[PDB]
Design an enzyme around this catalytic site. Sequence first.
Site, PDB file in Angstrom:
ATOM      1  N   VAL A  40      -8.111 -62.708  30.527  1.00 52.69           N
ATOM      2  CA  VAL A  40      -9.545 -62.821  30.293  1.00 52.69           C
ATOM      3  C   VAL A  40      -9.889 -63.494  28.970  1.00 52.69           C
ATOM      4  O   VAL A  40     -11.034 -63.893  28.749  1.00 52.69           O
ATOM      5  CB  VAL A  40     -10.239 -61.438  30.330  1.00 52.69           C
ATOM      6  CG1 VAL A  40     -10.126 -60.837  31.720  1.00 52.69           C
ATOM      7  CG2 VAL A  40      -9.619 -60.516  29.301  1.00 52.69           C
ATOM      8  N   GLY A  41      -8.905 -63.623  28.087  1.00 51.50           N
ATOM      9  CA  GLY A  41      -9.171 -64.258  26.811  1.00 51.50           C
ATOM     10  C   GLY A  41      -7.948 -64.500  25.954  1.00 51.50           C
ATOM     11  O   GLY A  41      -6.851 -64.042  26.263  1.00 51.50           O
ATOM     12  N   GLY A  43      -6.806 -65.640  21.536  1.00 52.56           N
ATOM     13  CA  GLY A  43      -7.258 -65.816  20.170  1.00 52.56           C
ATOM     14  C   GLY A  43      -6.063 -66.041  19.274  1.00 52.56           C
ATOM     15  O   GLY A  43      -4.930 -66.065  19.748  1.00 52.56           O
ATOM     16  N   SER A  46      -4.098 -62.509  19.473  1.00 50.61           N
ATOM     17  CA  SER A  46      -3.522 -61.983  20.703  1.00 50.61           C
ATOM     18  C   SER A  46      -4.026 -62.658  21.969  1.00 50.61           C
ATOM     19  O   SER A  46      -5.002 -63.414  21.949  1.00 50.61           O
ATOM     20  CB  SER A  46      -3.826 -60.487  20.806  1.00 50.61           C
ATOM     21  OG  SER A  46      -5.228 -60.264  20.895  1.00 50.61           O
ATOM     22  N   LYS A  63      -3.933 -56.206  25.134  1.00 53.56           N
ATOM     23  CA  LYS A  63      -3.906 -57.274  24.151  1.00 53.56           C
ATOM     24  C   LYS A  63      -2.468 -57.408  23.664  1.00 53.56           C
ATOM     25  O   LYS A  63      -1.945 -56.524  22.986  1.00 53.56           O
ATOM     26  CB  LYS A  63      -4.865 -56.970  22.988  1.00 53.56           C
ATOM     27  CG  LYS A  63      -6.303 -56.759  23.468  1.00 53.56           C
ATOM     28  CD  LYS A  63      -7.360 -57.107  22.423  1.00 53.56           C
ATOM     29  CE  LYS A  63      -8.756 -56.941  23.034  1.00 53.56           C
ATOM     30  NZ  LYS A  63      -9.840 -57.638  22.286  1.00 53.56           N
ATOM     31  N   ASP A 151     -15.754 -57.908  10.735  1.00 49.90           N
ATOM     32  CA  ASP A 151     -15.654 -59.016  11.682  1.00 49.90           C
ATOM     33  C   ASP A 151     -16.669 -58.858  12.803  1.00 49.90           C
ATOM     34  O   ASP A 151     -16.372 -59.093  13.973  1.00 49.90           O
ATOM     35  CB  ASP A 151     -14.230 -59.143  12.248  1.00 49.90           C
ATOM     36  CG  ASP A 151     -13.984 -60.488  12.936  1.00 49.90           C
ATOM     37  OD1 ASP A 151     -14.705 -61.469  12.632  1.00 49.90           O
ATOM     38  OD2 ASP A 151     -13.055 -60.575  13.773  1.00 49.90           O
TER      39      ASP A 151
HETATM   40  N1  LIG Z   1     -10.790 -54.017  22.921  1.00 48.42           N
HETATM   41  C1  LIG Z   1     -11.403 -54.397  23.828  1.00 48.42           C
HETATM   42  C2  LIG Z   1     -12.049 -54.866  25.019  1.00 48.42           C
HETATM   43  C3  LIG Z   1     -12.663 -54.112  26.037  1.00 48.42           C
HETATM   44  N2  LIG Z   1     -13.075 -54.977  27.001  1.00 48.42           N
HETATM   45  N3  LIG Z   1     -12.756 -56.258  26.656  1.00 48.42           N
HETATM   46  C4  LIG Z   1     -12.946 -57.400  27.292  1.00 48.42           C
HETATM   47  N4  LIG Z   1     -13.553 -57.375  28.506  1.00 48.42           N
HETATM   48  C5  LIG Z   1     -13.695 -58.404  29.385  1.00 48.42           C
HETATM   49  C6  LIG Z   1     -13.699 -58.083  30.743  1.00 48.42           C
HETATM   50  C7  LIG Z   1     -13.910 -59.074  31.700  1.00 48.42           C
HETATM   51  C8  LIG Z   1     -14.115 -60.398  31.318  1.00 48.42           C
HETATM   52  C9  LIG Z   1     -14.076 -60.732  29.967  1.00 48.42           C
HETATM   53  C10 LIG Z   1     -13.866 -59.737  29.013  1.00 48.42           C
HETATM   54  N5  LIG Z   1     -12.542 -58.545  26.752  1.00 48.42           N
HETATM   55  C11 LIG Z   1     -11.950 -58.508  25.564  1.00 48.42           C
HETATM   56  N6  LIG Z   1     -11.569 -59.681  25.003  1.00 48.42           N
HETATM   57  C12 LIG Z   1     -11.729 -60.950  25.707  1.00 48.42           C
HETATM   58  C13 LIG Z   1     -13.095 -61.580  25.434  1.00 48.42           C
HETATM   59  C14 LIG Z   1     -13.293 -61.912  23.951  1.00 48.42           C
HETATM   60  C15 LIG Z   1     -14.710 -62.457  23.730  1.00 48.42           C
HETATM   61  C16 LIG Z   1     -14.967 -63.709  24.572  1.00 48.42           C
HETATM   62  C17 LIG Z   1     -14.745 -63.404  26.060  1.00 48.42           C
HETATM   63  C18 LIG Z   1     -13.357 -62.808  26.314  1.00 48.42           C
HETATM   64  N7  LIG Z   1     -11.723 -57.392  24.877  1.00 48.42           N
HETATM   65  C19 LIG Z   1     -12.133 -56.245  25.441  1.00 48.42           C
END
Ligand SMILES: N#Cc1cnn2c(Nc3ccccc3)nc(NCC3CCCCC3)nc12
Length: 327
Positions: A40-41, A43, A46, A63, A151
């Site tokens: 989903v992401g 950086g 991580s 992560k 942050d």
């Molecule tokens: N701890 C925690 C944490 C809890 N949920 N979460 C999510 N949820 C998520 C669920 C579905 C789709 C996208 C994100 N993304 C990220 N990090 C990834 C995101 C960072 C910001 C830009 C979009 C992706 N970190 C977290």
Amino acid sequence: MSKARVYADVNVLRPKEYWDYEALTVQWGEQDDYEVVRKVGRGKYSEVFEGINVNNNEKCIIKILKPVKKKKIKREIKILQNLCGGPNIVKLLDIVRDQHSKTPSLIFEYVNNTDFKVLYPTLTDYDIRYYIYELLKALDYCHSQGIMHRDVKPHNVMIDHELRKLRLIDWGLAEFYHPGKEYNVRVASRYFKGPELLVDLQDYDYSLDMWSLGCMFAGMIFRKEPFFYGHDNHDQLVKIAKVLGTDGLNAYLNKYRIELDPQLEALVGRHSRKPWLKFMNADNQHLVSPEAIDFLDKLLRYDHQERLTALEAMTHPYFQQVRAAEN
Ligand SMILES: N#Cc1cnn2c(Nc3ccccc3)nc(NCC3CCCCC3)nc12
């Protein structure tokens, strides 16, 4: 010599078991309890995946951390543990590592987040007040627990809009506040860095998070992301100065006996303060009422000591309807 106006002695009164994060002994869980569902992401710190706990079939966020120093990871873990259960503070579910590579992974609660670039534009006036209030609960809580997030930015605020659930995440840059301590100014994301980081004032405090929150807020009500769009740290201060004016910056620098680097001083030049309403347009009209401006104005101050604390912010009349609904 600068010090926080609130919660200054939280870590002074608590024992070493609370703030001596380097003494922490990490208890590793089982990697096999979690499986990746989809990435989903990503950086610099991580790679992030939506995962699932094979035991209880509950969703989670995995992560996988890139190489990190023992001291740094212990700090993030200790802070997450200390803040466990606090209002809108993301929950750390587990900590695991790969045997052969020793690559560690942090397991968090899952939040069905919507890209802020897509979500924010659909938020109503009330939605903005509601979510910012929820974020403030998290900040007053961590500050009350002697921790600075350092942050705050949209990327670290997960929002499941359908459920109207918010979580402040990624505590990897957070630190414990100790009166008079000189911290590294290399924190926060550029567009959200407070003037203190930009002029090298090291003895900053919880108030840093309030400038960052102010930047997020200004971006939401003015429909301009990001609000202060600088291309490097020097230019970031310039962008701020072109709005708040150089008079306030000069006063700020004189109060704390700070001298800008010659190159920086030149780039800043001289600028008149620009009224917040000059950023008003047909697109952000249903969101820039006098209460919103007054609240924003009290967050975006050069002098970190002048900014509203998170507790004060929560009580500002701007949030009166949100508070009433909650009660
Ligand atoms: N701890 C925690 C944490 C809890 N949920 N979460 C999510 N949820 C998520 C669920 C579905 C789709 C996208 C994100 N993304 C990220 N990090 C990834 C995101 C960072 C910001 C830009 C979009 C992706 N970190 C977290």
